[PDB]
């Protein structure tokens, strides 16, 4: 279960607050175009929506927290400094196959005393596969640990 520092966090609640001027926790098209190129020049609406939607996966016109997390989230996959966290993946990987693979999770589950079947691993798989190409390496596990 890995994640951006608390600490980090914390302080991008200040910049997440610099565009949300009202403190609802979601940046509108207008509360964040202001601090945009409206400021200056005059762009086109078009511009806000594609600026706000590249980043509002969901589609709402509203730019939530972690949607503004997501662009530290493409400078770093994991925008983590401890190399002991990729340990974590060795630790689970027993085969040492260098992938996750449903077998290897089974028997785990079976130390732990868990009963899950083929099907249950898949809902975690798809989480990390997003690629589907048939691996599951230490970058796609990480999107296990967090949102989807
Ligand atoms: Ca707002
Ligand atoms: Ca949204
Ligand atoms: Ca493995
Ligand atoms: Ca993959």
Do not use: C, W
């Given at each position: 279960?890995?994640?951006?520092?608390?600490?980090?966090?914390?302080?991008?609640?200040e910049?997440?607050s610099?565009?949300?001027?009202?403190?609802d926790?979601?940046?509108?098209?207008?509360?964040?175009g202001?601090?945009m190129?409206?400021l200056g020049?005059?762009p086109t609406?078009?511009?806000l929506?594609?600026?706000?939607?590249?980043?509002?996966?969901?589609?709402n016109?509203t730019?939530?927290?972690?949607?503004?997390?997501?662009?530290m989230?493409?400078?770093?996959?994991?925008t983590?400094?401890?190399?002991e966290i990729?340990?974590?993946?060795?630790?689970?990987?027993?085969?040492?196959?260098?992938?996750?693979?449903?077998?290897?999770?089974?028997?785990?589950?079976?130390?732990?005393?868990?009963?899950?079947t083929?099907?249950?691993?898949?809902?975690?798989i798809?989480?990390?596969?997003?690629?589907?190409?048939?691996?599951?390496?230490?970058?796609?596990?990480?999107?296990?640990?967090?949102?989807?």
């Amino acid at each position: 279960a890995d994640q951006l520092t608390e600490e980090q966090i914390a302080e991008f609640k200040e910049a997440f607050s610099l565009f949300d001027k009202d403190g609802d926790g979601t940046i509108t098209t207008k509360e964040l175009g202001t601090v945009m190129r409206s400021l200056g020049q005059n762009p086109t609406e078009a511009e806000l929506q594609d600026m706000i939607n590249e980043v509002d996966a969901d589609g709402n016109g509203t730019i939530d927290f972690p949607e503004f997390l997501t662009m530290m989230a493409r400078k770093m996959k994991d925008t983590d400094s401890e190399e002991e966290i990729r340990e974590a993946f060795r630790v689970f990987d027993k085969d040492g196959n260098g992938y996750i693979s449903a077998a290897e999770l089974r028997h785990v589950m079976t130390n732990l005393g868990e009963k899950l079947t083929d099907e249950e691993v898949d809902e975690m798989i798809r989480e990390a596969d997003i690629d589907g190409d048939g691996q599951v390496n230490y970058e796609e596990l990480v999107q296990m640990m967090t949102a989807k």
